């Protein structure tokens, strides 16, 4: 009964109904839908009472379900009756029908058409019965619907829109089966017969389907023009909705004949927002659609470019004042217009400029680039980059817009996010979901602006240089320039500093443009004179910039950065001047402040000095030979400077001298190398340090924990007292400064890393590489044990069992120091701002003291890992000595005496850092002549360590999740998310290690064409042909696939495929362990688990390969497989596989076995 359906709909739609009542009503409706009379019932429901819109929509939905799901079951008569019902309902459209009712009726019509139209066209001279079955009168009926009334007009427009969208724009399955008949039928109905016959050649049976001879465009386009004159907004919008989907595919002769582009431009000149947006989309579709006829494309691009005034007027109309509030009605239209305009530059080399069309187009593009919104402005930056890079537009672009574009790009190179009340933030708060997204978009925008400046300076070096000189003179003669020049410290988030920083970035971009010009300009006879003139100009600019006597440290830092780019071009000419300027700018006293208090303005001076040192090292690397002539003066000057220089900059300067000593082919390399290196490396071999490094209490005392306990006792601090509330003291600041100075002097990790890496950078040929390796040998092999011992102590510091020997008053202090405060976007409701706020708040708190101690520990661990990695790069010296593998590995992994716990207390992030920094570079750093002595003593323990660590971490994570279901607070959720992400990244690092040690075997099961590198191939000989290394390796592989991670498990199986060729080498011990474990792991935890969807498919292929191999040569495998399956017929299953050659059919057999095991 219909009354029951009405009651069910009222229940399911009323908001007062509870969820259970709604579900009961929905169940009743579902059981109604499955009735065999559902199509007729839906038709009757839709026809009887059009007043109830919801009930009519339900009836139409019943018809849709009948025509979409049960279509194949219906016979020809039922299909014809359903088509007649749909046609009758469509013809009955009145004004009271809502929009969605019309859309549903159009959907019914389109479905029936897609499933019926064109069936008889695949047969020769079909009879009238087949034509009636194939809906020959669709075009006639659709044209009849076009004239019933205006509501039927809208219905027909929706029908056309849906039909064309499904046929062409969307990859619908039904049309894809019958594309070759449906698509030419659409081309028939939209195109005139004479136009159609030019391209297509079908007979009169096709002409029977077409009713209106003139086509459908000759109806829509005049109607659209009439609606535009009558200013009928709704009709224009509907026509553009229908017209937008029927322009990419149809024959271009129809587009040209009806002057569609003129109608689109007329729509654009209207004030209707929706009409403008659809005209924009239509114009872009016309521009980007394929053109069989090039002449029609030429006419299109000509008419588009001949209406640049109209486009400029449209853009001006779309503009608005965003000071109060942005207009959401036309701001997206502005973005669409700028996007469409940015795609027109491709056609520029084809427009025959007669009325200055190209000049007007480029002026319009530049005007759109001046838009206050960065999203709108940033759309044309790619256009400008591409135009400047190419030469087809350069003569046509330099004549009109190069100076104005350069001026804009200079003016737009500001820090938008740090300007208060900037007009761009109004658009930012709507286009961007967060401040971090806006900041990174601003960074990208400034990068592209700098690219624009660099390209302009390369193309137009003379004009750019003159303009830059004038701009710099004007700025430094301005009051802001006077403030910059007559000040020592500036607010690094205020206008006076930001403007000068922008000027210096512009200068850097100009220098980069000159560097680019060095290659861009053709190597003609005039190259040398122009290059000499450019070098003279750059030298003059550098001398002018230096004479300013800039004093701001964070800006003098940028000047020093640009010094390297100046030196790259000018070479020796200014080498000494820049070197002296950098040296003297790293020793400026700055009497106003003292640098030992770690102030906000002291950090700027520290950064300036660090940048000066790193640029000194870079300059020494670039031009070592030229520095040999002046080396004694440099040595004397630096030695004089040394007492008045910090340890960090001391190491930087010593590395600079070392670079000059090694690279510049100076005499007596060994003596100078010793005199430079030995004093810094002497701290490693200190007798007190050597004897105490094996004692943890000595390590704590050197770290200063005893002094921290004394300071806490003096302040009467207790464990029960919260450290997050205790205010800090300046005595603590002095204590931490002294402790960090003594620590960095005690363990010269930075000195060793810098010296080793920069000596490695001095290698150009193998012979001096060998002599340098011999030179570094006496300084490393007596120091490696102490570095490993330091890493040992840093690992043991995190163990809670080692803290009980400490005084009770610092038991919580070391625990607070151990924990880290890493933050991720998306892992918490907090953003970066309040997280940095929490860190800033702790500064004035005693908790920051423990945080700084932990930071010192982590920094020392990071630097000792980097030192170990650098020693690996030293070559054969680190691998030939027998003690190295055990010495490193025992240090990194601390097995607890009784329990097997890999370095207790070490976080997953720490293990990630250890693996990434030490294990990977060392594993890939083994020379091909040294694997045979280091690999077999390293991998057997390394794989055991990796397996134990991964198993312990994963088991702890799942156990903590299971025994603590509900978190106490959201902070527990954040901690769990961070732990899971870090564990996933650690597993990724481990599987990357495995891949680089063996090498995977491709995604396709039958493809193994991936050529392993020489290093990868060599390892497989060591690993697969050694039981000591092989057995732990399968344990890691067996665990890796078991672990709940899609990426590694899929990758690990791919590795296993490359291993299955050789791991089953008929070895008895390997084969047996493979049997009980891998089948148990793969079948029960990978194949039977749905969490490994993609891994299941790859593991299944691997499992099938092992199943055939093991059962063939080991009857015990069949018995073992019978037991875990608890039934089945392994012998029958094996026989069926071998008789089948296709893997696809073999996969079907395994799916049955796996599914059956799942049921059992």
């Amino acid at each position: 009964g219909a009354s029951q359906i009405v009651s069910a709909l009222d229940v399911i739609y009323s908001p007062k109904s509870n969820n259970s009542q709604r579900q009961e009503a929905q169940k009743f409706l579902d059981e109604v839908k499955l009735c065999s009379e559902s199509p007729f019932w839906g038709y009757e429901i839709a026809l009887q009472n059009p007043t109830n819109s919801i009930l009519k929509y339900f009836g139409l939905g019943l018809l849709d379900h009948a025509v979409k799901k049960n279509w194949n079951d219906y016979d020809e008569g039922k299909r014809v009756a359903l088509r007649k019902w749909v046609m009758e309902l469509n013809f009955g459209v009145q004004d009271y029908d809502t929009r969605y009712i019309k859309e549903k009726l159009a959907t019914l019509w389109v479905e029936v058409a897609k499933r019926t139209w064109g069936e008889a066209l695949k047969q020769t001279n079909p009879t009238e019965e087949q034509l009636l079955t194939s809906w020959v009168d669709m075009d006639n009926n659709l044209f009849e619907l076009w004239n019933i009334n205006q509501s039927s007009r809208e219905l027909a427009l929706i029908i056309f829109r849906i039909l064309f969208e499904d046929v062409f724009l969307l990859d619908d399955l039904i049309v894809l089966k019958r594309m070759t008949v449906i698509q030419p039928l659409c081309v028939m109905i939209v195109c005139p017969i004479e136009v159609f016959a030019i391209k297509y050649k079908f007979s009169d049976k096709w002409t029977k389907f077409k009713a209106n001879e003139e086509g459908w465009f000759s109806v829509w386009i005049p109607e659209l023009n009439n609606a535009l004159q009558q200013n009928n907004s709704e009709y224009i919008i509907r026509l553009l909705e229908t017209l937008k989907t029927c322009l990419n595919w149809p024959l271009t002769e129809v587009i040209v004949r009806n002057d569609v582009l003129s109608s689109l431009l007329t729509c654009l000149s209207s004030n209707i927002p929706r009409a403008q947006s659809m005209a924009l989309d239509s114009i872009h579709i016309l521009l980007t659609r394929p053109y069989s006829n090039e002449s029609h494309y030429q006419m299109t691009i000509d008419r588009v470019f001949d209406n640049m005034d109209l486009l400029d007027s449209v853009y001006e109309s779309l503009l608005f004042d965003p000071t109060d509030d942005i207009d959401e009605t036309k701001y997206p239209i502005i973005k669409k217009f700028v996007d469409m305009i940015s795609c027109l530059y491709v056609c520029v080399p084809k427009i025959k400029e007669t009325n200055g069309q190209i000049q007007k187009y480029f002026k319009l593009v530049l005007k759109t680039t001046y838009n206050p919104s960065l999203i709108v402005s940033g759309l044309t930056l790619d256009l400008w980059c591409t135009c400047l890079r190419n030469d087809e537009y350069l003569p046509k672009l330099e004549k009109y817009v190069i100076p104005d574009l350069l001026q804009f790009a200079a003016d737009a190179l500001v820090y938008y996010e740090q300007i208060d009340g900037h007009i761009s933030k109004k658009f930012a708060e709507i286009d961007f979901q967060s401040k971090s997204e806006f900041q990174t978009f601003c960074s990208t925008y400034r990068k592209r602006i700098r690219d624009i400046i660099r390209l302009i300076s390369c193309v137009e070096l003379d004009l750019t240089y003159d303009w830059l000189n004038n701009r710099l003179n004007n700025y430094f003669s301005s009051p802001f320039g006077q403030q910059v020049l007559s000040s020592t410290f500036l607010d690094h988030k205020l206008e006076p500093y930001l403007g000068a920083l922008s000027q210096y970035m512009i200068v850097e971009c100009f220098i980069n443009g000159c560097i680019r010009w060095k290659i861009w300009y053709p190597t003609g006879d005039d190259y040398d004179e122009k290059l000499d003139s450019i070098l003279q100009k750059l030298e003059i600019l550098s001398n002018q910039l230096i004479a300013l006597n800039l004093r701001e440290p964070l800006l003098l830092k940028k000047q020093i950065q640009n010094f390297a780019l100046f030196l790259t071009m000018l070479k020796d000419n200014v080498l000494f001047t820049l070197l002296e300027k950098i040296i003297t700018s790293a020793t400026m006293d700055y009497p106003e402040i003292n640098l030992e208090e770690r102030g906000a303005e002291s950090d700027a001076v520290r950064d300036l000095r660090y940048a000066c040192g790193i640029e000194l090292n870079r300059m020494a690397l670039l031009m070592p030979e030229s520095l040999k002539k002046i080396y004694p003066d440099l040595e004397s000057v630096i030695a004089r400077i040394m007492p008045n220089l910090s340890y960090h900059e001391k190491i930087s300067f010593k590395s600079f001298l070392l670079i000059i000593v090694l690279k510049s082919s100076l005499d007596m390399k060994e003596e100078r190398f010793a005199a430079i290196v030995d004093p810094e490396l002497l701290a490693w071999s200190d007798k007190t340090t050597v004897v105490g490094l094996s004692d943890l209490h000595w390590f704590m005392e050197r770290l200063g924990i005893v002094q921290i306990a004394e300071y806490f006792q003096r302040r009467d601090i207790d464990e029960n007292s919260d450290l997050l509330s205790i205010p800090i003291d300046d005595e603590g600041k002095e204590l931490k400064s002294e402790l960090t100075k003594r620590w960095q002097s005690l363990f010269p990790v930075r000195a060793t890393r810098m010296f080793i890496h920069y000596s490695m950078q001095s290698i150009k040929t193998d012979e001096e590489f060998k002599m340098l390796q011999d030179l570094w040998r006496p300084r490393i092999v007596p120091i490696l044990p102490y570095i490993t011992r330091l890493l040992y102590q840093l690992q043991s510091y995190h163990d809670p069992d080692n803290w009980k020997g400490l005084p009770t008053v610092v038991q919580s202090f070391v625990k607070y120091s151990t924990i880290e405060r890493f933050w991720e976007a998306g892992a918490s409701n907090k953003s970066k701002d309040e997280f940095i706020d929490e860190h800033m708040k702790a500064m004035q708190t005693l908790r920051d003291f423990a945080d700084s101690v932990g930071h010192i520990i982590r920094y020392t661990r990071e630097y000792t890992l980097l030192v170990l990695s650098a020693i690996s790069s030293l070559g054969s010296v680190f691998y030939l000595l027998d003690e190295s593998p055990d010495l490193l590995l025992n240090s990194i992994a601390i097995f607890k005496p009784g329990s097997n716990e890999i370095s207790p207390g070490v976080s997953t992030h720490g293990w990630k850092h250890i693996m990434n920094i030490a294990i990977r570079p060392i594993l890939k750093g083994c020379p091909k002549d040294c694997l045979g002595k280091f690999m077999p003593a390293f991998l057997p323990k390394l794989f055991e360590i990796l397996d134990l660590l991964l198993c312990q971490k994963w088991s702890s994570h799942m156990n903590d999740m299971d025994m603590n279901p509900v978190p106490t607070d959201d902070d527990q959720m954040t901690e769990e998310i961070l732990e899971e992400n870090l564990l996933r990244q650690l597993t990724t690092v481990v599987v990357r290690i495995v891949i680089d040690c063996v090498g995977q075997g491709n995604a396709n099961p039958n493809s193994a064409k991936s050529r392993l590198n020489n290093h990868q191939m060599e390892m497989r000989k060591i690993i697969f042909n050694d039981l000591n290394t092989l057995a732990p390796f399968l344990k890691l592989l067996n665990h890796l696939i078991s672990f709940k991670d899609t990426k590694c498990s899929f990758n690990s199986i791919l590795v296993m495929k490359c291993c299955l060729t050789s791991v089953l080498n008929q070895n008895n011990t390997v084969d047996e362990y493979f049997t009980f474990e891998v089948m148990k792991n793969l079948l029960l935890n990978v194949l039977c688990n749905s969490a490994f969807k993609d891994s299941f498919h790859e593991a299944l292929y691997a499992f099938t390969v092992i199943f055939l191999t093991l059962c063939k040569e080991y009857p015990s495998a069949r018995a073992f497989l019978f037991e875990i399956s608890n039934g089945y017929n392994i012998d029958e299953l094996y026989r069926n596989l071998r008789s089948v050659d296709e893997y696809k059919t073999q996969r079907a057999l395994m799916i049955d076995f796996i599914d059956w095991v799942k049921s059992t």
């Binding site: 980069n512 680019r516 290659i519 861009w520 053709p522 790259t568 870079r618």
Partner: peptide, 23 residues
């Protein structure tokens, strides 16, 4: 977290597009 080091293969800090060969 750690400090950056200059390599002799990339010591020049210019960001010129590598694909450029000539005009």
């Amino acid at each position: 977290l750690y400090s950056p080091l200059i390599h002799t293969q990339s010591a020049v800090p210019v960001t010129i597009s590598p694909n450029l060969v000539a005009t």
